[PDB]
Write a protein that binds this ligand. Structure first.
Ligand SMILES: *[C@@H]1O[C@H](CO)[C@@H](O[C@@H]2O[C@H](CO)[C@@H](O)[C@H](O)[C@H]2NC(C)=O)[C@H](O)[C@H]1NC(C)=O
Lengths: 113, 961
């Protein structure tokens, strides 16, 4: 690149057109910090915030409109009350289904099988 | 990572977490609502800036839920129309770490007085109407050693119900020492859950949790109840894999046992490798991995969507064609792979006279098939030699022909907005996330807001930017001689070419943006032959304004002290190719300028030698061709996560001030180094002559075991830490797989006669065989010496009862691989012990569609009922017709304070009309319209837990009442 001259002069001084140095002149005392930077970038993958996210399986960068009911139900099984209150998911609550169960009235049952 | 229960186990929790990414900019701050194992992004509504101190947040798809964050109070209040959650509440529930208001990144020492808050946990839950009902989570005090805060209690609202948690400390897992030169904040959970108390007006409970210390990690053994002789749930683990043990026996509450049997399935891995054409490559992306090929003699470009392993088993194949622009032979292409869009920069060539650079972008989601954004190519095409680009999830920004184009999507997917402001003199350029830090007379920062508003901030109060002035002076104090002395005019072109080359090389790498500090370096030469580098640092505030300005200076090598020793070949002295002479060259001051001059020559044993007769006249020419020999790559800035590397020095953060510390030259000369890969393994080069090694040291045994990677050089090798290391020696490749969590290395693999590709990645290595010239893609799992991978999976599950037993057996087939995980496409399950007695189910799982098809199979391996899942879903809908129960959320019903339980429903007319009322004097029901003659109802009026007909309380009335 910038220093093709010095390598070309050093390379011309090789015995019978044989590569004896094998990229020696580039590293007599010249540094190589970009390769070192690449090695440090490759070798360093550190997650320095296992405070509250730690132990997570799924995450949503946003809410999908088609999957609204699924994420609402999965929050519902975990006892998170901020969404099923407004979404009308009180039919999905087992305690309400079994408390409204009228004995000797098949219309009120909710038995899956 | 270990939770409070142990490894493999997570206890439920909810909070709001901050992801700043070591920067203070207000756009890059991300907030996440975490509920157990699920996360949702919070998005700032920039259209409504508020001066009360509180900013507003909301989520996609839920505009009916509102978040309000008060910074001065360290509080989030969030609600729907019924229930509000309060997170943080300052010292009650905030995890905060020491960090400055201008620099969130790592430092050498920290300021404990300064602090900033990273996580806000759930402090309180309440109801918008009837605020009496609530729940209060009380947390422990923050731990300064490891910033983890544990849940202590769940306090009562009206009827006393407390749930207290108690914990046990781990003295072993807590970190021993920190070896980082620049230290970052790290979080460690050193406590386990020991016992839970529950005191409620109905019941009382005291539970105790015990754990096993397999190796150096804890796992949940059992839950027991106090005054109960048998464990409620027992867990027993199988350690057939040392690094990852999995539970093989569970004890149920009914005191019946459930066992799982593990088997090691052997699947051949040659099927996962694939061979493809010479002009075809597979570039790995985060979510999707795409392969591009050159079809008709570099004229057009086929794009094909693939998966992590290079197949279409995970992601459906999509064929895209890029047309020739103007019938130009393609020289190079660079793909970039963002969530919503793929952008490929293509470099067309016109006869080496010019190089055009067209940006083809292909935006679609997953449901729709990738296709070209057919947008007017006004600014997505240019031919200039200073063409800078930067692609981001939300936007991208280009610079061609003195113009800064910026395309962004705000509030709309299918259209890109265009914005651009022309800029003038360009000497040193850098593009940030939403703008460009250009070099002018003064240092300026142009940026577009999320609202699209332009913001031009000029960052120069004191003297700055002597870049050009210092460089030309550096150039002119040394006389450099043209290639041929006889013709001055011809050599004037060569000296101009060198001066332009030096200007572009020094300036193009002399403007860095490390996190939120802009660094600009300049270099100059004194009369005395001394080089000084001066780097000016600008710390930027959260609103892209100058927090601070600093200047530090360092020394470069003097030209008088500098010497160059070359081995050189003299054909006129000896015919031996390896009997080389060596020349010493040095700069000597002649007149007013320095001139490089030969000094002396010696043999390869450092005894003086007469130079060759031909070389005695050629040496002057070779000094002219050499021109300026210097380590100029040292002066340019290479930036990493820790600090900025310039002139064998590192610029880092220390107590709010940016300081430069000596970087050892030996590491930068790649002669010796020790790079800590992980917790227990370190990449090590012991000495110069020793080959590249990977030493490891597990915690238990103090024995250093180093594997050798068979490479003397360090430029060949590449590091992809969690998985394989790779090295290219000569025309062969060597691959060293790494065990998970850096517990040691694996068996080395060698591939002869192959050339590595720069597209190789954590997921897959793509190479080119030299004999065939057909490139070969191998997934990470395919890098196995014996050519088979073992996937440990369960064979059967057996339920044992004192009255009967029951065994369900599983087998798996049609594997695929993806990163480090094997998955199976077709699983066969038998419900009984015998398969040939009663048949089975064969479930085929499509990974892309995520729909499974169950074929019920006769004992003679014949399909009795294909798509049996549809039958059961139709059946479920059929039995659901007679039953109806989807009625509570009606405003016509009379409800409680909380609103869970319907007291009274009125069907013909609604509760809004005050035509029907029913008061039962109890805790949960509050009614103010029934004022007693004295004043409204108090505790002294209602008799509690005395004999009523309905409920527990009643009202006692005297004459005056
Ligand atoms: C480091 O990589 C380079 C290639 O980038 C290797 O140089 C190759 O050496 C082989 C064998 O002598 C030649 O056939 C190739 O022609 C060379 N490179 C190319 C592509 O021209 C070098 O050998 C590697 N270092 C080590 C330790 O072997």
């Amino acid at each position: 690149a910038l220093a093709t001259g010095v390598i070309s002069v050093a390379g011309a001084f090789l015995g019978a057109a044989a590569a004896s140095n094998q990229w020696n002149p580039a590293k007599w005392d010249w540094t190589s910090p970009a390769v070192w930077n690449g090695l440090l970038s490759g070798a360093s993958i550190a997650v320095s915030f296992p405070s509250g996210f730690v132990g997570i399986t799924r995450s949503f960068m946003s809410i999908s409109s088609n999957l609204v009911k699924m994420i609402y139900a999965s929050l519902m099984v975990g006892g998170f009350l901020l969404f099923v209150y407004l979404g009308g998911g009180m039919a999905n609550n087992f305690n309400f289904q079994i408390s409204q169960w009228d004995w000797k009235s098949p219309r009120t049952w909710f038995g899956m099988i | 990572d270990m939770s409070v229960l142990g490894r493999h186990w997570t206890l439920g929790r909810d909070c709001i977490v901050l992801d700043h990414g070591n920067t203070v900019f207000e756009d890059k701050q991300d907030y996440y609502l975490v509920k157990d194992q699920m996360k949702i992004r919070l998005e700032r509504d920039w259209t409504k800036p508020s001066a009360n101190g509180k900013v507003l947040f909301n989520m996609v798809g839920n505009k009916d839920a509102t978040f309000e964050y008060t910074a001065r109070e360290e509080k989030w209040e969030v609600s729907d129309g019924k229930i509000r959650y309060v997170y943080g509440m300052n010292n009650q529930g905030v995890v905060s770490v020491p960090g400055w208001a201008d620099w969130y990144g790592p430092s050498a020492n920290y300021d404990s007085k300064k602090i900033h808050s990273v996580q806000w946990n759930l402090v309180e839950i309440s109801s918008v109407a009837h605020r009496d009902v609530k729940l209060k989570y009380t947390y422990t005090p923050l731990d300064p050693s490891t910033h983890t805060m544990h849940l202590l209690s769940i306090t009562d609202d009206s009827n006393k119900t407390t749930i207290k948690f108690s914990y046990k400390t781990i003295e072993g897992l807590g970190k021993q020492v920190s070896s980082g030169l620049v230290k970052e904040h790290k979080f460690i959970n050193n406590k386990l859950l020991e016992k839970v108390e529950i005191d409620s007006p109905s019941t009382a409970q005291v539970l105790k949790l015990t754990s096993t210390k397999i190796d150096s990690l804890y796992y949940l053994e059992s839950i027991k109840q106090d005054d109960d002789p048998d464990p409620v749930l027992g867990f027993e683990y199988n350690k057939d894999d040392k690094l990852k043990p999995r539970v093989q026996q569970i004890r149920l509450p009914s005191k019946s046992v459930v066992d799982f049997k593990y088997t090691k399935q052997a699947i051949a891995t040659q099927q996962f490798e694939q061979e493809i054409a010479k002009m075809a490559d597979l570039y790995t992306g985060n979510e999707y991995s795409l392969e591009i090929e050159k079809t008709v003699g570099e004229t057009d470009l086929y794009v094909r969507l693939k998966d992590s392993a290079g197949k279409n088993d995970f992601i459906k194949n999509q064929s895209i064609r890029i047309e020739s622009y103007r019938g130009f032979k393609i020289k190079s292409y660079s793909p970039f792979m963002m969530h919503s869009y793929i952008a490929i920069l293509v470099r067309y060539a016109e006869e080496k006279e010019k190089l055009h650079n067209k940006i083809y972008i292909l935006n679609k989601g997953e449901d729709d098939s990738w296709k070209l954004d057919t947008t007017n190519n006004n600014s997505r095409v240019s031919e200039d030699k200073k063409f800078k680009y930067d692609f981001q999830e939300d936007s991208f920004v280009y610079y061609h022909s003195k113009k800064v184009h910026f395309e962004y999507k705000k509030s709309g997917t299918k259209v890109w907005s265009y914005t651009s402001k022309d800029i003038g003199d360009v000497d040193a350029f850098t593009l940030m996330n939403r703008g460009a830090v250009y070099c002018k007379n003064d240092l300026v920062l142009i940026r577009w807001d999320a609202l699209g508003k332009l913001q031009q901030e000029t960052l120069s109060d004191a003297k700055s930017k002597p870049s050009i002035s210092d460089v030309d002076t550096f150039f002119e104090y040394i006389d450099v001689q043209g290639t041929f002395p006889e013709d001055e005019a011809e050599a004037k072109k060569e000296v101009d070419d060198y001066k332009r080359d030096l200007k572009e090389s020094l300036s193009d790498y002399g403007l860095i943006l490390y996190n939120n500090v802009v660094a600009l370096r300049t270099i100059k030469l004194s009369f005395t032959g001394r080089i000084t580098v001066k780097v000016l640092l600008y710390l930027l505030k959260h609103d892209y304004t100058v927090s601070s300005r600093s200047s530090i200076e360092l020394q470069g090598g003097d030209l008088a002290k500098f010497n160059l020793t070359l081995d050189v070949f003299d054909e006129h002295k000896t015919k031996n190719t390896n009997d080389l002479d060596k020349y010493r060259f040095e700069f000597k001051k002649q007149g007013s300028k320095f001139k490089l001059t030969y000094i002396e020559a010696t043999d390869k044993d450092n005894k003086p030698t007469k130079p060759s007769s031909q070389n005695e006249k050629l040496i002057g020419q070779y000094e002219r061709r050499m021109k300026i020999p210097l380590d100029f790559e040292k002066y340019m800035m290479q930036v990493n996560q820790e600090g900025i590397i310039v002139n064998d020095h590192q610029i880092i953060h220390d107590n709010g001030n940016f300081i430069a510390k000596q970087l050892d030259r030996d590491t930068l000369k790649l002669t010796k180094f020790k790079i800590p890969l992980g917790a227990f393994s370190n990449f090590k080069k012991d000495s110069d002559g020793d080959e590249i090694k990977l030493c490891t040291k597990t915690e238990q045994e103090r024995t250093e075991s180093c594997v050798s990677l068979q490479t003397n050089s360090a430029r060949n090798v590449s590091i992809k830490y969690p998985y394989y290391l790779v090295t290219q020696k000569k025309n062969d490749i060597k691959v060293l797989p790494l065990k998970i969590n850096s517990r040691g290395w694996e068996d080395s693999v060698d591939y002869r006669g192959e050339i590595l590709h720069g597209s190789s990645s954590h997921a897959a290595m793509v190479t080119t065989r030299m004999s065939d010239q057909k490139t070969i893609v191998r997934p990470l799992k395919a890098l196995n010496k014996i050519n088979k991978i073992y996937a440990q999976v369960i064979s059967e599950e057996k339920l044992t009862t004192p009255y009967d037993s029951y065994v369900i057996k599983y087998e798996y087939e049609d594997p695929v691989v993806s990163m480090n995980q094997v998955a199976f496409k077709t699983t066969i399950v038998v419900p009984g012990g015998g398969k040939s007695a009663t048949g089975y189910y064969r479930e085929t799982n499509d990974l892309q569609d995520n729909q499974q098809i169950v074929q019920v199979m006769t004992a003679d391996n014949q399909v009795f009922d294909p798509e049996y899942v549809k039958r059961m879903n139709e059946m479920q809908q059929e039995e659901d017709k007679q039953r109806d129960g989807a009625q509570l959320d009606a405003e016509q019903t009379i409800t409680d304070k909380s609103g869970y339980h319907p007291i009274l429903k009125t069907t013909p007319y609604s509760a809004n009309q005050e035509l029907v009322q029913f008061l039962g004097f109890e805790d949960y029901e509050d009614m103010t319209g029934w004022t007693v003659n004295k004043r409204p109802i108090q505790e002294s009026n209602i008799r509690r837990n005395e004999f009523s007909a309905t409920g527990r309380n009643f009202l006692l009335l005297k004459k005056g009442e």
